[PDB]
Structure formats: C-alpha cells, structure tokens
C-alpha cells in the first residue's frame with residue numbers, strides 16, 4: 310500500500326485510458342479530465358506509465374522511485390514533466406506530458422528526403438542541450454542519452470525521457486563502458502552521438518562494428534566521421550563531446566551557449 314501525496318494525486322474516474330503507446334514498464338495513451346483546477350472541464354491528452362501484468366516487487370519499487378525523482382526535479386520546457394498520479398485503490402499510474410510525434414529517431418527517419426531545414430535540426434539540438442543543462446543543474450545524471458530517449462510534441466518541442474533510472478553501448482563514454490562511472494561528462498559524450506544522429510536524420514552509429522571491436526577503437530582514438538549535410542563547426546562540437554579525458558569535454562552550459570549562437574546565424 311503506497312502513501313498518498315495530495316500535490317500529485319489524480320482520481321481514477323478523471324483518467325480515460327486509450328491505446329498502447331510503448332511496451333521496462335507499460336505505457337498507454339490517455340485523457341485526463343480537469344488537471345488544471347482553473348479549468349476543470351478541459352480534457353488533456355497524457356501518457357500513463359504503469360507496470361506490466363507479470364511485474365515483480367522490485368519493478369514496483371523502481372516505478373515508485375522514478376515517480377519520487379520526477380517530483381524533486383521540477384518543471385522545464387525540454388523534459389517529460391510529471392502531471393499527476395493514481396497511487397490508491399488500484400495499480401500505480403504515473404501520468405506525464407504526451408508527445409504526439411514520437412521519439413526523435415523515428416521523427417527524423419520519417420522526415421528523410423514534411424522537410425526539415427538546417428535551422429530546424431540545430432534548434433532540435435539546442436532544445437536537447439537546454440533540457441540537459443536543466444537536469445545537470447538539478448544533479449540528475451541521465452546514463453542513457455539518445456534520440457530514442459528524446460520525445461517530440463505537437464508543437465515541435467524536444468523533451469528528454471527516461472532520465473535518472475536506477476544497443477546502448479554505442480552511446481556510452483569509455484569510462485562508463487569500462488568502469489561503470491556515470492557522470493555529467495559521460496552524458497556529454499552521449500550528446501555528441503545525439504548530434505551525429507540529428508545530422509544523419511536518425512542514423513545508426515558505428516555501423517557494422519561489433520561490441521568487442523568498439524572497446525578497442527575508442528581506446529586507440531577512432532571517432533565517427535562527419536555527416537554529409539553537416540558543417541565543420543557542428544562536427545567540432547561532436548569531436549569536443551568525444552574528448553578522451555572527461556574534464557576536457559564541454560559542459561551543457563557551453564553547448565547551450567554555442568548552439569544558441571549557431572541557431573541565430575543559420576537560415
């Protein structure tokens with residue numbers, strides 16, 4: 310039996326569950342009635358994460374921990390924000406903001422040659438940087454930053470997902486891969502691969518490279534090549550994110566500052 314929290318508790322009769330959206334815990338589309346108490350007759354489209362039918366006691370503990378983490382972090386434009394929850398007299402439902410256009414990898418893959426400009430791709434990169442600047446300032450390490458874990462809203466807002474949970478190897482920094490040392494600097498390495506994903510329109514990184522070979526290539530100092538539709542300045546930003554010593558990588562503050570200047574100058 311879970312403790313009630315009046316700040317976040319939505320009644321179950323205010324939540325109409327819809328189609329399944331995604332299958333590490335089950336997610337469904339839903340409609341919430343009267344979230345903003347200013348307008349109690351308004352319907353809001355929401356994503357509702359829950360446990361699977363064959364879920365353990367440890368899975369419940371993780372999903373509770375995930376909910377409590379999201380309360381502490383607070384609201385930002387470029388993250389999947391908590392909107393409410395159903396904890397009492399039924400299954401745990403963690404209600405969050407709905408992102409109608411899916412994850413960023415599929416969004417880009419679908420829109421390969423409506424078309425997206427150069428300015429749209431750098432804007433997309435800036436919003437992911439701005440959202441990670443926030444999560445870093447709230448002391449939250451992602452551990453798994455990628456285009457699959459960025460969602461896209463109806464109004465083209467990039468929202469970071471699956472942040473701070475208690476193949477992925479191609480996004481991990483060497484220190485994270487070898488020693489399991491996850492830091493804010495290892496999330497920058499992962500952001501570098503996320504840039505490479507954006508400017509390849511959802512490309513698969515290190516293609517035809519097995520797991521055993523990828524350990525050696527990074528140790529020896531090999532990196533991914535420049536994309537075709539991509540400037541030199543933006544590739545230097547990728548290469549700086551992929552610096553071997555973690556202290557020498559840029560911060561998300563610097564990346565936000567650099568990307569803000571680039572979006573302004575791009576057409």
Ligand SMILES: CNC(=O)n1ccc2cc(Oc3ccnc(NC(=O)c4ccc(C5CCN(CCO)CC5)cc4)c3)c(OCCOC)cc21
Nearest residue numbers: 330331336356358389405406407408409410411470471472
């Ligand atoms: C730290 N904890 C958290 O961050 N989280 C807590 C709860 C939680 C819930 C999450 O699920 C959500 C949230 C918001 N939106 C979604 N959207 C979709 O799945 C979606 C996917 C694909 C389509 C496509 C449908 C078909 N057409 C085709 C053209 O018409 C193209 C769009 C449309 C929609 C899922 C989540 O996202 C990551 C995992 O997703 C399974 C992170 C979460």
Ligand SMILES: [Cl-]
Nearest residue numbers: 316317318393
């Ligand atoms: Cl609420």
